[PDB]
Design a protein around this ligand. Structure first.
Ligand code: JFS
Ligand code: JFS
Ligand code: JFS
Ligand code: NAG
Length: 349
């Protein structure tokens, strides 16, 4: 089990002002540290945040968090479940800021809620340095869904923070799962306006090089992986289903009824091709042709393969590449080319 620690700086808070925190399982024999960001959509105004507070309160408060959590998938310490990093120091950071990990605003006379996701990451890192992170060789910042987008928004900030704090030997890297979206046309009737809204409501922050490209008012562009990834300096591995369920949800597509007619067939096929295209210059990536959502903390995450190679293998190959020339039999760029959901036999059932 991973054990809860509430932040010692109690001014870094969840939405309702309760302290943020992290769950930790130490591995004294290891210099590898894995910090995972939870997901779970977001809220963008007073009224829909109030709704979230009544029926999704664990994503807005620490309030009712349990003392322990079980590490699963990439957070498992068992080699049978986690071939990649079973011996690492494990950290799960709960998502209680509802801001896609981008916010830097406190509760105040003006603000009913605090949106502090970017500062929560900062403070977890600072407090872990006294608990063994000071001796790390690699810090892998990982996350799923909103946490995957959060990796893209925060990985270079963590690298800069450690450089500033006097720890230049820690190699910061990112693993973004299910956070690589396309700002495409919807299948039926704008969705980017909510991001737009949210950034203003949260005082949201984006990576500086991306901000300098798009400039005031256009920071929403940096929430889209294919636009923000080229501005990042830390190594980032991208995991994305070609037919992601959150992408299809915001596109107003519901693949439940049996008959799919020509217009929807072409829409689905074009979406997969466009995603494939955005990953073509991403050398570390894993993109299976499946209809699903999230991948890395589920217990059977080892089952899926692209061109015969599993995700835990691909991640191991990525480690070797970061010790340039590709490696014999140990690939790192794995993107399906078949054009329909579940044309890969290994997709989750
Ligand atoms: O599963 C139903 C379903 C429908 C829509 C959405 N959704 C779309 N954009 C969003 C922005 C913020 C929060 C939820 C959002 C989620 C879930
Ligand atoms: O968790 C808060 C929360 C906010 C918004 C929603 N939501 C529901 N239907 C939507 C359609 C478009 C955008 C957002 C939507 C659900 C949940
Ligand atoms: O135009 C398609 C379309 C896809 C995704 C979204 N989207 C909504 N909330 C988001 C948060 C982070 C990244 C993308 C997000 C909007 C539009
Ligand atoms: C707590 O964190 C806040 C927000 O980052 C910061 O302003 C403050 O300096 C911190 N407090 C202490 C005592 O370090």
């Amino acid at each position: 089990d991973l054990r809860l620690h509430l932040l010692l700086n109690t001014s870094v808070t969840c939405n309702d002002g309760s302290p943020a925190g992290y769950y930790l399982k130490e591995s004294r024999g290891s210099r590898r540290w894995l910090l995972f960001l939870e997901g779970g959509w977001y809220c963008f105004n007073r009224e829909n945040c109030d709704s979230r507070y009544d029926t999704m309160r664990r994503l807005m408060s620490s309030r009712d968090w349990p003392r322990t959590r079980t590490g699963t998938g990439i957070l498992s310490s068992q080699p049978e479940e986690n071939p990649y990093w079973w011996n690492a120091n494990m950290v799960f950071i709960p998502y209680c800021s509802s801001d896609v990990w981008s916010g830097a605003s406190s509760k105040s006379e003006k603000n009913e809620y605090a949106f502090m996701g970017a500062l929560i990451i900062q403070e977890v890192v600072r407090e872990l340095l006294g608990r063994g992170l000071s001796g790390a060789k690699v810090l892998l910042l990982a996350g799923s869904s909103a946490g995957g987008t959060g990796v893209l928004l925060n990985v270079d900030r963590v690298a800069e923070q450690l450089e500033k704090l006097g720890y230049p030997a820690i190699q910061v890297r990112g693993l973004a799962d299910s956070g690589w979206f396309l700002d495409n046309k919807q299948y039926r009737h704008a969705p980017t306006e909510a991001i737009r809204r949210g950034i203003r409501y949260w005082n949201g922050v984006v990576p500086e090089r991306c901000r300098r490209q798009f400039q005031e008012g256009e920071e929403w562009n940096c929430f889209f992986g294919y636009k923000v990834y080229p501005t990042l300096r830390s190594p980032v591995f991208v995991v994305q289903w070609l037919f992601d369920e959150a992408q299809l949800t915001v596109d107003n597509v519901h693949l439940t009824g049996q008959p799919v007619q020509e217009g929807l067939r072409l829409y689905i096929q074009n979406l997969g091709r466009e995603l494939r295209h955005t990953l073509k210059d991403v050398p570390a990536s894993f993109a299976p042709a499946c209809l699903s959502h999230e991948i890395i903390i589920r217990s059977h995450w080892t089952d899926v393969q692209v061109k015969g190679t599993s995700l835990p293998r691909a991640l191991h190959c990525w480690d070797r590449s970061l010790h340039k020339t590709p490696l014999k039999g140990c690939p790192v760029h794995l993107v399906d080319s078949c054009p329909w959901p579940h044309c890969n036999p290994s997709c989750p059932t």
